[PDB]
């Protein structure tokens, strides 16, 4: 009652600019939900509104959708899917299993997106040529993030890099960082064939190109969004679909509690502590 009369002052402890729950209509970063559905955007448009507070072009939202589609799942052998399956076979929960799987997303697993994007952005902004970038990475004892595959090298490419690369070539206005990454890929494939642009590296460079090549963002905004981990969120949201699918598969198959075989564990305990 005192606040309604404007008699007292209490500073707000929280700030938000992505969603307005109060009012007659739900609002996504200044846009009504009915107008969101009338403009015929999908997951990509809502993702852009909620994450960047920008009205992205149709091709940008579609490309975001493709990025979510290609990172949906990569089998059960990865650390995150393995953890999700372990938690599901314990009969815990959907939320708990997906959460346990997602908690492995980090530097070694699921972080090649942001790492590759940052490395290629730093190389491109430093003004060094791709050969100089390759030599600098080699002499620093660092492997180029987003470069290298396990089986598919040439005349048999990823089939996930190809689709995204074709979409970006056809629809993106300008792709400077993608061209720089493709020159780096040519140089690395001149060494050994399987040193191609990964799905992670391609998605990172194309996401940076989309951020700093569409009229929605300034260079500072794109750099800040890359720094704060927008591609980490992209990968996590994409792989959550596969993790939930794995949980549902394990609960449908009615798999019992898993216990790791003792023959697969090496015990190196001390003599007596």
């Amino acid at each position: 009652w005192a606040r309604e009369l404007g008699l007292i002052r209490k500073p707000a402890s929280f700030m938000t600019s992505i969603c307005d729950e109060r009012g007659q209509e739900l609002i996504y970063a200044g846009m009504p939900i009915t107008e969101v559905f009338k403009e015929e955007m999908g997951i990509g448009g809502v993702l852009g509104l909620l994450w960047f507070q920008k009205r992205l072009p149709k091709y940008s939202c579609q490309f975001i959708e493709m990025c979510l589609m290609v990172t949906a799942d990569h089998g059960p052998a990865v650390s995150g899917a393995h953890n999700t399956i372990i938690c599901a076979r314990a009969g815990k929960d959907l939320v708990s299993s997906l959460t346990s799987g997602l908690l492995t997303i980090g530097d070694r697993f699921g972080g090649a997106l942001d790492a590759a994007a940052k490395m290629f952005s730093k190389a491109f902004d430093s003004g060094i040529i791709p050969m100089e970038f390759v030599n600098k990475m080699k002499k620093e004892g660092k492997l180029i993030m987003g470069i290298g595959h396990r089986v598919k090298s040439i005349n048999n490419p990823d089939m996930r890099v190809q689709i995204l690369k074709d979409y970006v070539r056809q629809h993106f206005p300008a792709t400077p960082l993608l061209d720089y990454a493709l020159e780096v890929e040519k140089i690395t494939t001149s060494k050994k064939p399987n040193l191609i642009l990964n799905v992670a590296g391609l998605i990172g460079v194309a996401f940076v190109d989309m951020l700093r090549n569409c009229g929605s963002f300034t260079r500072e905004e794109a750099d800040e969004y890359i720094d704060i981990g927008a591609l980490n969120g992209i990968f996590v949201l994409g792989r959550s679909m596969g993790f939930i699918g794995h949980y549902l598969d394990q609960k449908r198959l009615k798999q019992g509690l898993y216990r790791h075989p003792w023959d697969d564990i090496s015990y190196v305990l001390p003599e007596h502590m």
């Binding site: 404007g6 002052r9 500073p11 707000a12």
Partner: protein
């Protein structure tokens, strides 16, 4: 040369140090003085990254930038003509010397008490050379009803 009118209704000041209560009192004084804009344009705190601190303009909520370095604060706010220094006796000298490297600052207020007299004399000499008016250290500051208020002068609202 040192001017005659140090403060007016358009005076903008930069506050060195994290003094939220003093800045809020300054803003309340400006609001009750029917000022168009707050007298504090930015804050300087070297022990944190650049951000925005939340303050009150009457009942409205406003954001005041906080900068790690003096240079950024004077770059983004060329309209600032006053420095209110809330640095300790062990940092007032260096902060004032750094401030007098910017010509836009014409008045500097030093609140610290216990500064050595030699350092204060050096500050006075440099201020006289640069024509910068310094409200001597170990002071609350000053008040100009309707135009500007320094720090915690005049108490609360």
């Amino acid at each position: 040369g040192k001017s005659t009118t140090l403060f007016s209704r358009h005076t903008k000041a930069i506050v060195w140090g994290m003094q939220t209560r003093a800045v809020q009192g300054m803003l309340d004084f400006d609001y009750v003085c029917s000022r168009d804009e707050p007298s504090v344009a930015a804050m300087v705190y070297p022990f944190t990254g650049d951000h925005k601190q939340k303050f009150y303009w009457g009942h409205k909520e406003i954001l005041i930038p906080v900068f790690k370095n003096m240079a950024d604060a004077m770059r983004k706010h060329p309209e600032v003509d006053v420095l209110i220094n809330f640095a300790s006796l062990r940092s007032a000298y260096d902060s004032t010397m750094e401030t007098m490297n910017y010509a836009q600052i014409r008045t500097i207020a030093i609140i610290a008490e216990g500064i050595p007299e030699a350092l204060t004399r050096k500050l006075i000499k440099k201020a006289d050379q640069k024509g910068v008016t310094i409200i001597g250290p170990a002071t609350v500051g000053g008040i100009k009803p309707g135009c500007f208020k320094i720090g915690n002068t005049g108490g609360m609202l």
